[PDB]
Design an enzyme around this catalytic site. Structure first.
Site, mmCIF file in Angstrom:
data_model
loop_
_atom_site.group_PDB
_atom_site.id
_atom_site.type_symbol
_atom_site.label_atom_id
_atom_site.label_comp_id
_atom_site.label_asym_id
_atom_site.label_seq_id
_atom_site.Cartn_x
_atom_site.Cartn_y
_atom_site.Cartn_z
ATOM 1 N N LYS C 10 9.019 13.917 -58.018
ATOM 2 C CA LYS C 10 9.118 12.636 -58.703
ATOM 3 C C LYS C 10 10.182 12.505 -59.792
ATOM 4 C CE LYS C 10 4.342 11.709 -57.370
ATOM 5 N NZ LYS C 10 2.949 11.353 -57.779
ATOM 6 N N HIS C 116 4.282 15.089 -55.152
ATOM 7 C CA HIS C 116 3.403 14.491 -54.155
ATOM 8 C C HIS C 116 3.397 15.394 -52.933
ATOM 9 C CE1 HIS C 116 1.734 11.979 -51.000
ATOM 10 N NE2 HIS C 116 2.810 12.264 -50.290
ATOM 11 N N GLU C 127 4.490 10.069 -43.216
ATOM 12 C CA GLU C 127 5.362 10.148 -44.384
ATOM 13 C C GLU C 127 6.739 10.717 -44.040
ATOM 14 O OE1 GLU C 127 2.983 12.319 -47.264
ATOM 15 O OE2 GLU C 127 1.890 10.483 -47.772
#
Lengths: 142, 142, 142, 142
Positions: C10, C116, C127
């Site tokens: 992130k 994540h 994903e």
């Protein structure tokens, strides 16, 4: 509370030259190394430390392994350090240790899981006293 | 040939908790850590190690800094270790250290360069002897 | 079984320049990085990936954070990779994550927990497909 | 001045799973990773990037090694980054590279020397343009 816990980087990990990797993991997890030394246990020292184990089948093997090469013993300081260190280390059996824990990442086998951590505040004080003498535990002053 | 050299991780580096990162750099470069211990120099111990600088204007400040917090002293072993260690550390003066060297990466100021390495085989013998007594250095046995 | 799972480093972690530290943790844990790229999500792309959260209260804040700076998205391969990756990351909330897990070591807060990981083999597939086209995931040939 | 230089982590290093270690060295040396992607060059793509060697000595061998496994290509940003990156990598020949440099630490041979770095600001611009399309480099926004 701020606690001091005892760490052993076992012969297999020292032999593989991953002392730095392990120390780096201690520091990244928030522990401050306040005492450390490399030594090679004599059988007298090993049997005086692991006496508790003098009663199980793998005792002789444990003493043989722990005296087979140099180890690094350390004192780690931090809030709730004893339990957090156990958390960082992971399961005793590398097979059951979660990915990322020190036992999963650096163990070579169940008996050779690479690291030891005090199981309680009480045992930590005893283990630290066994290996660290006067002026060997150094409080941070900066 | 195989040599042993002396290392110091200074008070500023210990305080920043990068002992592991530094040890990991030594091991990745092929050095074997054969002796190590954390200690906090008293003024008298610092004055003795830096005795060659007694009487110089910068001496008291050097002694103050080197006793301002705990340090880690170590013995590193490997082929041509004295020179290779100096090569890994980079120039003593950070202003001249090449990017990526330990002094370039961990110096906090020009004065507090974070690490020391023996400058010669002769000085390595003197520095190792100063801190490591009969057998505090443990050769690899496996 | 050998599986592939999806990872996001992130904005807060990229900004602190710990991409290498995180990748090193992936590798030390036994994962092989088989795909990776740095990008900066647009609001449209962020909303599309987090569509299943569209409407909820935290949605806008989540989208704002995930578009606030660049991120690194990757595909990790290994035995039981999906679950082992979750194990490595630790609890979603830093306050509950065990010492040493990626959330514990690199999270700045609950919203900015730094990493994540896919929660299932099914979601990992979705994903990965979202960010990686054909040819972008590279199996090891040596 | 702030520059952007090009980096390749070659097939031998990717295969050894030291991508994290290398990235961590880039970041510890002060570089910011502003672009990165993992790819597996095809013979056609490799012949294109090394087209200048056509009809020259190592064209075939160069293409063969560089297409032997996946690589990681990145853009590193920082003050005087082109030269500082070269300083961090060390000599092309790992045997002569100074201890601690990336060629010394992560390579075994001249050909499979683990890393590539642009040799000038001019070559950096050309190299980056071959692997990163317009808008793929991500400046830091926090």
């Amino acid at each position: 509370a701020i606690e001091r816990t005892f760490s052993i980087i076992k012969p297999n990990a020292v032999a593989k030259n991953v002392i730095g990797n392990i120390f780096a993991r201690f520091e990244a997890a928030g522990f401050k190394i306040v005492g450390t030394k490399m030594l090679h246990l004599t059988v007298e020292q090993a049997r005086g430390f692991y006496a508790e184990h003098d009663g199980k089948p793998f005792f002789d093997g444990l003493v043989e392994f722990m005296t087979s090469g140099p180890i690094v013993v350390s004192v780690l300081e931090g809030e709730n350090a004893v339990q957090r260190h156990r958390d960082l280390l992971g399961a005793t059996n590398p097979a059951n240790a979660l990915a990322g824990t020190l036992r999963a990442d650096y163990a070579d086998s169940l008996t050779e899981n690479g690291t030891h951590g005090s199981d309680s505040v009480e045992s930590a004080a005893r283990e630290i006293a066994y290996f660290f003498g006067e002026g060997e535990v150094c409080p941070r002053t900066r």
